[PDB]
Every structure is written in structure tokens, then in C-alpha cells.
Amino acid sequence: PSTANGGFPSVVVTAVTATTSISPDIESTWKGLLAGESGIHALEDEFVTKWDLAVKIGGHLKDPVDSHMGRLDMRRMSYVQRMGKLLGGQLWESAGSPEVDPDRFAVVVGTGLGGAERIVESYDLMNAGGPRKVSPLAVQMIMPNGAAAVIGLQLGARAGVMTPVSACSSGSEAIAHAWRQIVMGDADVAVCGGVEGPIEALPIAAFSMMRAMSTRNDEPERASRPFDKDRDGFVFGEAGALMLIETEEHAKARGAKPLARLLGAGITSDAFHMVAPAADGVRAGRAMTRSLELAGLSPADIDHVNAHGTATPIGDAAEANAIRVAGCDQAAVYAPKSALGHSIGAVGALESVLTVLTLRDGVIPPTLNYETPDPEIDLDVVAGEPRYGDYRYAVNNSFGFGGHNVALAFGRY
Amino acid sequence: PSTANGGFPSVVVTAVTATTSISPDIESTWKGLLAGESGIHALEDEFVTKWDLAVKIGGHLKDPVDSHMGRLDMRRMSYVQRMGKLLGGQLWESAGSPEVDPDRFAVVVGTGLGGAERIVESYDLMNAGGPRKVSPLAVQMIMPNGAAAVIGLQLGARAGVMTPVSACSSGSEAIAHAWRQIVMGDADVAVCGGVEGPIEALPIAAFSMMRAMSTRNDEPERASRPFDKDRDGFVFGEAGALMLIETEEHAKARGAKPLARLLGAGITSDAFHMVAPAADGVRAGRAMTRSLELAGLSPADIDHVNAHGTATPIGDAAEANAIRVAGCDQAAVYAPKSALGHSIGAVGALESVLTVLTLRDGVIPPTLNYETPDPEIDLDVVAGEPRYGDYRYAVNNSFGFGGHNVALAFGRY
Ligand SMILES: CCCCS(=O)(=O)Nc1ccc2cnn(C)c2c1
Ligand SMILES: CCCCS(=O)(=O)Nc1ccc2cnn(C)c2c1
Ligand code: NA
Ligand code: NA
């Protein structure tokens, strides 16, 4: 059974929304990327100087979430819940605010951590003034399922509200599970993607102590260098992204113009290391292959790969092998983290949206800072200027800390 | 397409393990439940007196997790990761330490929050001595996928390692996603269940401030009263539980004796309120109905319902209506939280293990403290003494905060 042979129903993407370090509008982010713009700049936050952080570069949201948040929302929601509500409403507006059947409507939103800022706040409030100072809203804000719950409550999703956690692959895995919920018959329509918290001292400190982050502080826009010889780790780039997916029949019934097709989703694991990807990239490649199997495609059909491309030395090397294992080494490769950075749980979702626009507009943006290619890798990396091309099919890769491999297979409508 | 009509492959439960407030051995916990034992006692912890908490009753694990943990594990892992390692090894040994194909082996372990203690630790450390005092493993310990990532690395699962966060239904949802992974053909064997943190002052404060918790401190063992007229909220009971599921062919090939059959799983949502369940129980009942559709069963086939049964006035009323909607109100109902309390993300997995043991031994333990029937409920609640029977099929219910509904359909082997 596959999408090609009619074993699974046809699933199409009908709307996308995203907020990034370049722009709060996905179509503006897309234009910026095509122009070779970067969202990564020098961090001017006071916490950088306070702690004298080794990492002084980051990509803040161009339009911060809380600028669209009144006092009420600031009191009753965690940050990721607030981002979810914002993106949830924008997405629904862009889809024409359709009246769908709630019992056939599901929500699957991934996240890296959850409402962690409310944990420390409640911790502090209890330490200072005792258990009565902990809010009765604390549980619903802290719980990592909260963002998905807020969106499901907002839009009225009654065919399931799910939250997969797989670190960097959470946003892509969310879309994978949304696809599954539809193809198994549990829903006809689904909002899916990923949300994540902002850059701060403690996140910077924590990830910096892993020694996986770039420290090229003097040249922020040149710091993130996926598949480049002079790469020194990943760069934080704040993001949130959701897409609306549904059966082609459902889309056709309400007159929705599809942006792209979601043909298959592959989920595998390494069982190798807690934070480092497997060097051979076999299991990561198997995730790509599995998505092709479910889509009913062969590697030869894959014209484009939106790479995970963290810019860690071992990460990019592993992925290069992974693509080769999947037999997609002839595909045109893009590494959006070169310009948008790493948004952890949201990044798989943001990059899935980018893959949809690639297929829609038939153009791949240039991978920034790809000046001196790494001799070992040997990939067809799109760079210099955007590459216009006849892209029929694409695979979006997302590989998370813990050994989590998610591959999504998309097709041009 | 169903399990009955051969649409899905036959999936069987071949091994179980759990640590509870009654015992570290699942077979001993099971005997205790049949004898009418309770794991809920007066909390002798210092934080109870220190803060003068409204709740002074809880069920700590009989055998603490850390009593099996050395110095490396205590510094390199979070609590839920440590619980995961322990139960992971115990399950594998109970299964006969089989040599499975890692590429067809998956792990799905749910949890409520994650390595939350390491967040407040990192926060305190950084505030005291700056960013360099934060642990290098802070990220891999804090990340909520960490428990599942530990177990997948421990046992060598390469067909996917996933963590669903669904609050009270996390453990059940994990089994649900494990079932899905096997039936869609991505794996043949799967370790699945749930883990959760211990009882502490802040967890108590957070849940008790919602007025969700029982305050019957004078009589700890009589506090948790699911479906009883005089019920006043849930009681904390620490737990962790995992089960080994696999296809019947795979089980037969290695000579593994099945304990029960996993026939189907239904996942729906309320989209009603952030913490309160929907009064009508319609979507909760649809979760039950969906598990039957996929199992290939009818409501008449269901002889047993392992209820969510938290003992909240609102929660039990909703579940009573949900069972009516599913057409399962003539089924024999058991509420294990009466004796084992609420373990949040692990409780759905624990009660799935209890459902398996019920179908294996053909006996339902008594629902503790069910003395005065509530007029509104009108359920056949097993109480006073255990009820023996040739039980053919059972449905395990989990309805978590956020409106997440998971129903698991089990069958006698
Ligand atoms: C730009 C992505 C990095 C953020 S993180 O990976 O540390 N997750 C994260 C999640 C929630 C909150 C709330 N406050 N903060 C600071 C958070 C951080
Ligand atoms: C017995 C179930 C209640 C625990 S909870 O729902 O508050 N989750 C939880 C998870 C992790 C940790 C670590 N320390 N602590 C205290 C934790 C607590
Ligand atoms: Na990607
Ligand atoms: Na149950």
C-alpha cells in the first residue's frame, strides 16, 4: 500500500504559517531567503553581557510573539502556548476560515521542551511565598501538551490533539503523525507543525556546554555554515511554523487551492548516541527510504532535499552519508539553517513549509556561507543565487538529539 | 480494515513490567490488588511539614528507583531516564532477553513532563555560579524524549524512538503509537509504556491548587474513591510501567508465550476546556468506539472496562457518560487508581498492564472505597471482593488534562 497505488488517500497541504528571524510573514521570509538574507545577528540582550556568554550570536524573531499578546494572554499561557495561538489563528485565516467537521479535525504540534519558564516561575513563587502562591493555571501552562491543546481548543479539533517530542525532529514528526492520523482514517483535516521557546541565557548556556554551537561572534551572518569546511556548530534561530493538511477530496469540496502534496513520512532511530548522530547515516537514510516507500516513489524521483544541515562537523558529515544511503545524492540540496538558524522543536516544521514553497514556486534559495565545500561530503548544494528548476518531488530531513530520524516526502501539486 | 478481518496483523503482549506504590514486582502488585491492598499512605516527607501542604497523603514507590542507581547514572541521567533504564532492563530480562532485529524494533515511551528537576537545577546552578556551572548533559537529561532515547539506546531499537506527551494519557498513547507503528509495517516488535517523576511539594501544590486532589489526610487508604458518592479528588501514586508488544508471527518465531492481544487504539480530543473534561463524554466515548472499529469488535463484545477513574467529581461523571456513549455500560468496571493512585504520564501504561493481567488470569480486582454508589454514574463497578470470569475483551481508558482521550482495546489470548 502506498500513495502512488491509491493504498493511502491523497493528502495535500492547503495553508502554511510561520514566524522567523527574517519576518513574521512566511511569504516575506521566502522572499528574503531568495534574496540571500540572513536572520542571524549579534545578540544585544542584556543577559549576554551579564553572564559573559561564549555564544553572542542569535536569530531573534523579527516580530516578537508577545507584541501580539494582551495582558490576559500573558497571564494564562506559557510562551509556546502563546506562539501556538498566534500561529493557529493566522493559519486559519489564511485557509479562508473554513467550517470543518470538528470530529474529523486533528491537531499535532511538536515542541522541544514545553512551558519550562512556568516551572521555574512556580518554583520561585513557592520558595518565596509557599504553596498558595502557585497558580491554579500552572499545570495547564507547564504541561508540554499545552501548546497543541490551546490550538485544538482555539480551532475546535476533536479528532485528536497530539504532541510528539523528539528534539530537533519534533516539528517534522508532528507532520508525520498528522499524515498518519489522516491515512489511517481518524481524521480528514489536520493542523500540524512545531513551536519553540525564545533564545535566553539558560538555553544558550545549556547548549553551549554540549559544545555544539558556533562561536563566530564577530561575523553573525557568517556563523552558520552547513556543509562548509569552516563550520563550527549550529546557531540559534527562533521560529514557529504550522501547516494545514487535508485529504484532496476535502480540499476540493471546499474549493481550497493546494500548495503541495504530502505523500509519505518515515520515522526511524539510530540507537547509537544520546546527542551525536550515527556516522554511517544508515538509519537516517532508512527514514528517507521509508518515506519514499509509503509515497510510492523511488530515489530517482527525488529532485530536491531540504537538509537538516545543522552545521556541526559530525552532523553534516553523517547527513551526507544518509542522503547517499537513500540514493538521493543527485538531488539539489538546500540547508535553510544557513540563513534561519536552529529552532529546535519548530525547525522540522518551518523547513517542511519551505519545502512546500520550493515545490510550489519551483525555486530553491541559496545555502548561505557555502564558500569552501568540505572535500568529504560531495553534495549538490544550491548556493550563490536561487536555483529555478522543475522540482517534482522533495524529501525534508530532520534528525534530532536522541537519535530521532524523521523524513517527509512532498510532491508538487 | 481491522484486526478481526485480517486487515491489520495480529499484535500480542509478550511481557510486562512495572514499579508501583505496592511493589517493584508486577506480579506482587497484582496479588496485592486482589487482596485489597492500598499503596497510598501518609507522607512522611520533610516537604509536607515544611510547607504545611493541604495534601499530606501519597503513594511512594515501594522500592525507590535510585536504590538501583550508581554514581554515574545519578549524575548523567534525570529521574525519568533512570526509571526508564531500570524498567527497560527488567522487561527485556522478563521477555527472555531475545535477539530481535534492531531495524524492526521500536520504542514508544510517554511521559508527563520530562527531566524537570534538571531544569530547576540548571536554573539554580547558573544563578549561583554562572553559565559554566550548568551541566554538559543538561540538554540530554532535560529533554522529555530522554527516557525513550535512553531505553532505545539500551535495548538497540532502530525502528523509531518516540515520546508522546498527553498528560494523564501519555502512557496509554505511547502504547497506541507503538501499535500503529507495527500495524503500518514500520516495526515487528516494540517496547512501550510510560514513566513519571516522584511526589514532591511543587507537584502537590500545582495540582492541589486546581482543587483536583483529595484532602482526606486522616484516612490515607480511604482517600481515593473513584465513582464513589463521597469522592473528593485524585491521589498521587508513583509508578512506571512498560510492556513488550510484537506481531503474533514474531512472538511464535522466538517461542514467546503471549499474555494478551492488543487489538486496537482510539485517540480523540474534547476541544472543550484546558483541564476539565467534557461533561457529555461524547469524544471520550468516541475514543472507545474507535478502538473497537480498528479491533473489529462491537460494544457487546466488551466484558471489561479498566476506567480512568481519577476520583474527581467532574472526571468520573464525564467517564460514566463516555462509557454509555460507547455502549459499554454493561461491562464490568474497575478503577485501579482507588488502590494505586494517579501516576500521570505513566498511569495509562500501568493500567494497560493491569488490563492484560485481568484478561490473562480472568479476574478483576475490587475497586477500593466504592461504598456509596453515585446516582448519576450507574456503572457495574467491581467492588468488595475480586470478580472472576472468562473475560474475552477489555477496554483501557485514559482521559488526560487538556482533553486528550485514549482508549486501548485488549483481547484474551
Ligand atoms: C531558540 C530555541 C531555543 C529555546 S530552548 O530550546 O531552550 N526551548 C525553550 C522552551 C521554552 C522556553 C521558555 N523560556 N525559554 C527561554 C524557553 C526555551
Ligand atoms: C507522582 C506523579 C507526580 C509527578 S509530576 O506529575 O509532577 N511529574 C514530575 C516529573 C519529573 C520530576 C522530577 N522531580 N519531580 C518532583 C518530578 C515530577
Ligand atoms: Na530540513
Ligand atoms: Na484505565
Side-chain angles (χ1 to χ4, degrees), chain A residues 380-397:
Chain A
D380 184 17
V381 182
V382 173
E385 71 180 21
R387 188 191 290 189
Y388 288 82
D390 188 29
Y391 312 117
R392 309 160 298 173
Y393 303 102
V395 177
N396 175 41
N397 289 344

PDB file of all heavy atoms in Angstrom, chain A residues 380-397:
ATOM      1  N   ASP A 380      25.259  18.116  -4.085  1.00  0.00           N
ATOM      2  CA  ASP A 380      24.844  19.189  -4.988  1.00  0.00           C
ATOM      3  C   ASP A 380      24.112  20.275  -4.196  1.00  0.00           C
ATOM      4  O   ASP A 380      22.879  20.351  -4.206  1.00  0.00           O
ATOM      5  CB  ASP A 380      23.965  18.638  -6.120  1.00  0.00           C
ATOM      6  CG  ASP A 380      23.586  19.701  -7.147  1.00  0.00           C
ATOM      7  OD1 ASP A 380      24.227  20.774  -7.186  1.00  0.00           O
ATOM      8  OD2 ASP A 380      22.635  19.462  -7.921  1.00  0.00           O
ATOM      9  N   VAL A 381      24.889  21.117  -3.518  1.00  0.00           N
ATOM     10  CA  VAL A 381      24.348  22.173  -2.661  1.00  0.00           C
ATOM     11  C   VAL A 381      24.025  23.420  -3.484  1.00  0.00           C
ATOM     12  O   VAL A 381      24.894  23.947  -4.186  1.00  0.00           O
ATOM     13  CB  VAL A 381      25.347  22.558  -1.549  1.00  0.00           C
ATOM     14  CG1 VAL A 381      24.757  23.625  -0.638  1.00  0.00           C
ATOM     15  CG2 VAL A 381      25.758  21.332  -0.746  1.00  0.00           C
ATOM     16  N   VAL A 382      22.779  23.888  -3.391  1.00  0.00           N
ATOM     17  CA  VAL A 382      22.353  25.111  -4.071  1.00  0.00           C
ATOM     18  C   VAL A 382      22.929  26.322  -3.343  1.00  0.00           C
ATOM     19  O   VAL A 382      22.676  26.512  -2.153  1.00  0.00           O
ATOM     20  CB  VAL A 382      20.813  25.231  -4.124  1.00  0.00           C
ATOM     21  CG1 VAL A 382      20.395  26.585  -4.674  1.00  0.00           C
ATOM     22  CG2 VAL A 382      20.220  24.113  -4.966  1.00  0.00           C
ATOM     23  N   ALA A 383      23.694  27.140  -4.062  1.00  0.00           N
ATOM     24  CA  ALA A 383      24.365  28.298  -3.472  1.00  0.00           C
ATOM     25  C   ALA A 383      24.640  29.388  -4.506  1.00  0.00           C
ATOM     26  O   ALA A 383      24.458  29.181  -5.706  1.00  0.00           O
ATOM     27  CB  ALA A 383      25.661  27.864  -2.804  1.00  0.00           C
ATOM     28  N   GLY A 384      25.076  30.550  -4.024  1.00  0.00           N
ATOM     29  CA  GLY A 384      25.344  31.708  -4.878  1.00  0.00           C
ATOM     30  C   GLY A 384      24.084  32.519  -5.122  1.00  0.00           C
ATOM     31  O   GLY A 384      23.931  33.619  -4.592  1.00  0.00           O
ATOM     32  N   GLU A 385      23.186  31.972  -5.935  1.00  0.00           N
ATOM     33  CA  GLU A 385      21.874  32.577  -6.179  1.00  0.00           C
ATOM     34  C   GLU A 385      20.815  31.478  -6.257  1.00  0.00           C
ATOM     35  O   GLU A 385      21.158  30.311  -6.448  1.00  0.00           O
ATOM     36  CB  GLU A 385      21.894  33.415  -7.464  1.00  0.00           C
ATOM     37  CG  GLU A 385      21.973  32.618  -8.759  1.00  0.00           C
ATOM     38  CD  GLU A 385      21.983  33.503  -9.991  1.00  0.00           C
ATOM     39  OE1 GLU A 385      22.326  34.700  -9.881  1.00  0.00           O
ATOM     40  OE2 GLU A 385      21.641  33.002 -11.079  1.00  0.00           O
ATOM     41  N   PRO A 386      19.527  31.842  -6.100  1.00  0.00           N
ATOM     42  CA  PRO A 386      18.476  30.819  -6.144  1.00  0.00           C
ATOM     43  C   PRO A 386      18.456  30.006  -7.442  1.00  0.00           C
ATOM     44  O   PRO A 386      18.656  30.564  -8.525  1.00  0.00           O
ATOM     45  CB  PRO A 386      17.175  31.625  -5.988  1.00  0.00           C
ATOM     46  CG  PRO A 386      17.550  33.060  -6.145  1.00  0.00           C
ATOM     47  CD  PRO A 386      18.989  33.166  -5.748  1.00  0.00           C
ATOM     48  N   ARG A 387      18.227  28.700  -7.320  1.00  0.00           N
ATOM     49  CA  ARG A 387      18.158  27.807  -8.475  1.00  0.00           C
ATOM     50  C   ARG A 387      16.713  27.508  -8.871  1.00  0.00           C
ATOM     51  O   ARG A 387      16.012  26.759  -8.186  1.00  0.00           O
ATOM     52  CB  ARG A 387      18.883  26.492  -8.195  1.00  0.00           C
ATOM     53  CG  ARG A 387      19.002  25.606  -9.429  1.00  0.00           C
ATOM     54  CD  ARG A 387      19.476  24.206  -9.090  1.00  0.00           C
ATOM     55  NE  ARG A 387      20.871  24.181  -8.667  1.00  0.00           N
ATOM     56  CZ  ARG A 387      21.586  23.074  -8.475  1.00  0.00           C
ATOM     57  NH1 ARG A 387      21.048  21.870  -8.671  1.00  0.00           N
ATOM     58  NH2 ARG A 387      22.852  23.172  -8.083  1.00  0.00           N
ATOM     59  N   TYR A 388      16.284  28.089  -9.988  1.00  0.00           N
ATOM     60  CA  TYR A 388      14.979  27.785 -10.566  1.00  0.00           C
ATOM     61  C   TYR A 388      15.046  26.428 -11.258  1.00  0.00           C
ATOM     62  O   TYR A 388      15.996  26.147 -11.985  1.00  0.00           O
ATOM     63  CB  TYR A 388      14.564  28.880 -11.555  1.00  0.00           C
ATOM     64  CG  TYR A 388      14.190  30.173 -10.870  1.00  0.00           C
ATOM     65  CD1 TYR A 388      15.168  31.079 -10.463  1.00  0.00           C
ATOM     66  CD2 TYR A 388      12.860  30.483 -10.611  1.00  0.00           C
ATOM     67  CE1 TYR A 388      14.826  32.261  -9.823  1.00  0.00           C
ATOM     68  CE2 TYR A 388      12.509  31.661  -9.975  1.00  0.00           C
ATOM     69  CZ  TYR A 388      13.492  32.545  -9.582  1.00  0.00           C
ATOM     70  OH  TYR A 388      13.136  33.713  -8.951  1.00  0.00           O
ATOM     71  N   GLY A 389      14.052  25.580 -11.018  1.00  0.00           N
ATOM     72  CA  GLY A 389      14.076  24.227 -11.566  1.00  0.00           C
ATOM     73  C   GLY A 389      12.759  23.482 -11.505  1.00  0.00           C
ATOM     74  O   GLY A 389      11.843  23.865 -10.773  1.00  0.00           O
ATOM     75  N   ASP A 390      12.683  22.406 -12.284  1.00  0.00           N
ATOM     76  CA  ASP A 390      11.475  21.597 -12.407  1.00  0.00           C
ATOM     77  C   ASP A 390      11.432  20.524 -11.317  1.00  0.00           C
ATOM     78  O   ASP A 390      11.672  19.343 -11.574  1.00  0.00           O
ATOM     79  CB  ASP A 390      11.433  20.958 -13.801  1.00  0.00           C
ATOM     80  CG  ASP A 390      10.115  20.265 -14.092  1.00  0.00           C
ATOM     81  OD1 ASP A 390       9.078  20.695 -13.548  1.00  0.00           O
ATOM     82  OD2 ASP A 390      10.118  19.289 -14.872  1.00  0.00           O
ATOM     83  N   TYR A 391      11.117  20.947 -10.098  1.00  0.00           N
ATOM     84  CA  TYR A 391      11.144  20.055  -8.938  1.00  0.00           C
ATOM     85  C   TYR A 391       9.788  19.385  -8.745  1.00  0.00           C
ATOM     86  O   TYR A 391       8.806  20.036  -8.390  1.00  0.00           O
ATOM     87  CB  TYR A 391      11.557  20.823  -7.681  1.00  0.00           C
ATOM     88  CG  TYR A 391      12.784  21.685  -7.881  1.00  0.00           C
ATOM     89  CD1 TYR A 391      12.714  23.071  -7.759  1.00  0.00           C
ATOM     90  CD2 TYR A 391      14.014  21.115  -8.204  1.00  0.00           C
ATOM     91  CE1 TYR A 391      13.833  23.864  -7.946  1.00  0.00           C
ATOM     92  CE2 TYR A 391      15.140  21.903  -8.397  1.00  0.00           C
ATOM     93  CZ  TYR A 391      15.043  23.276  -8.263  1.00  0.00           C
ATOM     94  OH  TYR A 391      16.152  24.070  -8.449  1.00  0.00           O
ATOM     95  N   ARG A 392       9.745  18.078  -8.985  1.00  0.00           N
ATOM     96  CA  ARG A 392       8.505  17.306  -8.894  1.00  0.00           C
ATOM     97  C   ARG A 392       8.303  16.779  -7.477  1.00  0.00           C
ATOM     98  O   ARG A 392       7.209  16.874  -6.923  1.00  0.00           O
ATOM     99  CB  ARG A 392       8.536  16.120  -9.865  1.00  0.00           C
ATOM    100  CG  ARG A 392       8.911  16.464 -11.302  1.00  0.00           C
ATOM    101  CD  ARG A 392       9.385  15.228 -12.054  1.00  0.00           C
ATOM    102  NE  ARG A 392      10.590  14.653 -11.451  1.00  0.00           N
ATOM    103  CZ  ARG A 392      11.153  13.502 -11.816  1.00  0.00           C
ATOM    104  NH1 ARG A 392      10.638  12.767 -12.798  1.00  0.00           N
ATOM    105  NH2 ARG A 392      12.248  13.081 -11.190  1.00  0.00           N
ATOM    106  N   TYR A 393       9.364  16.210  -6.905  1.00  0.00           N
ATOM    107  CA  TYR A 393       9.306  15.599  -5.575  1.00  0.00           C
ATOM    108  C   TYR A 393      10.459  16.069  -4.699  1.00  0.00           C
ATOM    109  O   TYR A 393      11.534  16.405  -5.199  1.00  0.00           O
ATOM    110  CB  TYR A 393       9.341  14.075  -5.691  1.00  0.00           C
ATOM    111  CG  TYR A 393       8.233  13.508  -6.546  1.00  0.00           C
ATOM    112  CD1 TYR A 393       8.474  13.098  -7.855  1.00  0.00           C
ATOM    113  CD2 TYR A 393       6.940  13.387  -6.049  1.00  0.00           C
ATOM    114  CE1 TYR A 393       7.459  12.578  -8.642  1.00  0.00           C
ATOM    115  CE2 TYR A 393       5.919  12.869  -6.828  1.00  0.00           C
ATOM    116  CZ  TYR A 393       6.185  12.467  -8.123  1.00  0.00           C
ATOM    117  OH  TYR A 393       5.173  11.953  -8.900  1.00  0.00           O
ATOM    118  N   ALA A 394      10.228  16.086  -3.390  1.00  0.00           N
ATOM    119  CA  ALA A 394      11.243  16.513  -2.436  1.00  0.00           C
ATOM    120  C   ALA A 394      11.128  15.774  -1.107  1.00  0.00           C
ATOM    121  O   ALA A 394      10.030  15.408  -0.680  1.00  0.00           O
ATOM    122  CB  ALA A 394      11.151  18.013  -2.211  1.00  0.00           C
ATOM    123  N   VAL A 395      12.272  15.555  -0.464  1.00  0.00           N
ATOM    124  CA  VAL A 395      12.314  14.980   0.876  1.00  0.00           C
ATOM    125  C   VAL A 395      12.924  15.989   1.843  1.00  0.00           C
ATOM    126  O   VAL A 395      14.022  16.498   1.609  1.00  0.00           O
ATOM    127  CB  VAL A 395      13.126  13.671   0.916  1.00  0.00           C
ATOM    128  CG1 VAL A 395      13.215  13.140   2.339  1.00  0.00           C
ATOM    129  CG2 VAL A 395      12.497  12.632  -0.001  1.00  0.00           C
ATOM    130  N   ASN A 396      12.190  16.285   2.914  1.00  0.00           N
ATOM    131  CA  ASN A 396      12.669  17.136   4.003  1.00  0.00           C
ATOM    132  C   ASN A 396      13.233  16.270   5.129  1.00  0.00           C
ATOM    133  O   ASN A 396      12.512  15.458   5.707  1.00  0.00           O
ATOM    134  CB  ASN A 396      11.519  17.998   4.539  1.00  0.00           C
ATOM    135  CG  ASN A 396      11.911  18.814   5.761  1.00  0.00           C
ATOM    136  OD1 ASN A 396      13.013  19.365   5.833  1.00  0.00           O
ATOM    137  ND2 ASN A 396      11.005  18.897   6.730  1.00  0.00           N
ATOM    138  N   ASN A 397      14.517  16.449   5.435  1.00  0.00           N
ATOM    139  CA  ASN A 397      15.169  15.701   6.512  1.00  0.00           C
ATOM    140  C   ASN A 397      15.142  16.457   7.834  1.00  0.00           C
ATOM    141  O   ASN A 397      15.280  17.683   7.864  1.00  0.00           O
ATOM    142  CB  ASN A 397      16.626  15.389   6.159  1.00  0.00           C
ATOM    143  CG  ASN A 397      16.759  14.344   5.070  1.00  0.00           C
ATOM    144  OD1 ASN A 397      15.813  13.623   4.755  1.00  0.00           O
ATOM    145  ND2 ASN A 397      17.947  14.256   4.489  1.00  0.00           N
TER     146      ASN A 397
END
